[PDB]
Amino acid sequence: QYREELELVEDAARFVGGMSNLIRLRQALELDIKYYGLKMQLNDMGYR
Amino acid sequence: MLLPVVARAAVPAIESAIAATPGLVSRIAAAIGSKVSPSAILAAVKSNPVVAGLTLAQIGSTGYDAYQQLLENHPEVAEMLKDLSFKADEIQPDFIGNLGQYREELELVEDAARFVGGMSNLIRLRQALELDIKYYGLKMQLNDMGYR
Amino acid sequence: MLLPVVARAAVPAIESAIAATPGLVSRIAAAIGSKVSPSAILAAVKSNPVVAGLTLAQIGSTGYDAYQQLLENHPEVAEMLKDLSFKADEIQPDFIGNLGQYREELELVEDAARFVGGMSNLIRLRQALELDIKYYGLKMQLNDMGYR
Amino acid sequence: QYREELELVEDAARFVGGMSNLIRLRQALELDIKYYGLKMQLNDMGYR
Amino acid sequence: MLLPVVARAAVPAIESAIAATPGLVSRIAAAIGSKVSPSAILAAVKSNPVVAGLTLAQIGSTGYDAYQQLLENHPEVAEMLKDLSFKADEIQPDFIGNLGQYREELELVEDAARFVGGMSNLIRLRQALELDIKYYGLKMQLNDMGYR
Amino acid sequence: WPWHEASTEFAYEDAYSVTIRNKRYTAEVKEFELLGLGQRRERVRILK
Amino acid sequence: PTSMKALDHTSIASVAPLERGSVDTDDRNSAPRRGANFS
């Protein structure tokens, strides 16, 4: 019954890159927005 | 010497602040280092734009416009006044060890951002995936009717 | 599969943690995805080092030496295990606004550093200027005797 | 009475640079140690 | 990140010192700059080896083995850890004047040293002249009998 | 003289994607593979 | 073996620039930049 699920997961992996890349991307989209604000402020002060 | 274009708007604002309260006159006299009398500090304001800018930093409620006018007229008073006006802010004791806990995670934000494109591309992709399914269905139906 | 040097320290650790308390067995069965029986989770540990590192992360007191030994002997498991074992820290509400007050001042520190040399050179220069004067006298006295 | 003081001030300014540089260096060496630790940690995480 | 070889020796020693006394926890939280909780300072220790060396210097009884093993395995942290770890070795009020009186003696010691050889040759010659006359008679007896 | 303001760090990653009959194929590439190198060298800098 | 420890502790005659800057930048490496997406 899981062939509907695994083929979709493998297609998303072929899109993104590695499976670890998919996991880190899913975590970054799951992540809170204040971290995006913090990274934008560190880039604002001149830090890259 | 202070230029008259600044002085026309700079002098009566300081005079009105002194007429509002004299408790700031001792403050600006101890801050610049002139005599406590209002005529002496006003002569110092008229004779030195740096002293004028330090007074317009001590009072900024009404003297904000005069401060901006002296800022726009003379740049060198600002270049010296940023150095002469510096208060080191208080730092939290927990700040750097608190900031150490985010190293694991800003790296993850940047590793996503390099792949997506810009920061704005990441934010717009996040909003588009967090958006409702009926907007995708509306997009598909407008494409079904022949629109793009 | 799993290296025996890792297994000889990991298997009695997990078995002793189960013998100490049984409430962690359902926890690692839910976290890893195995059957709740100890034979099943122990066979999963002996079969897969990723599963072994996940169990040795779920038990933390008696499993730190075995976890770090697995991290020594299996270099390929590190990034995948860190990606699977990830918890985002909570952020203070006032942190970025408190950080924005310090931009005026880290720039001052960097402008001091570009003059002095290294950051280490700045730290050592600040220590030397904070240092007592008898050490300057001792330097001059040892050079006065003819010692360098 | 102040010839002893102004001569030392001007000799320090000759070494440092301008009087603005002397004021900024005096502020930096008057500054707390936590800011130095903060700049070290932002450099440790990879931010210039 | 800290090495696992250092971490195996560093983390349980810090955990044992905290379990032995919690009065060091606020001390190392104020010295390093983290939150006062043991989990937060342990996250700081695992994140940054400079912070690990600072903690292993602050706890001084049990952390010497871990400190020297960190100094073995991370050789590049030594200069910055020595810059951050600096305390003023307090000078005595009579030390410089007491030192200035020994120029009369050290010059004679160094001149006798240059005449003899090294300082080792001077110490061995002083021991030979301090040694008993019975040994000179015994070695003359051995040289008369034939023992060189 | 300051060589660091007049030189730049040179590192790069790119990827080419094409769909061949409802299947996407991606091809990554790095800069040392283009420059005729085999090993990633990390010290070299280009004058801007 | 022939020791070189006495020869090791020397010093190079330091001499100042005309323009400052670029001091602490000796050992730093940022990540490689990506290319744009293609379509």
From Swiss-Prot, chain F:
This is Major inner protein P1. P1 is the major inner capsid (core) protein of the polyhedral procapsid, which is responsible for genomic replication and transcription. Forms a dodecahedral shell from 60 asymmetric dimers. Binds to RNA and may be involved in genomic packaging. It comes from Pseudomonas phage phi6. Homodimer. Associates with the polymerase complex. The gene is P1. It is found in: Virion.
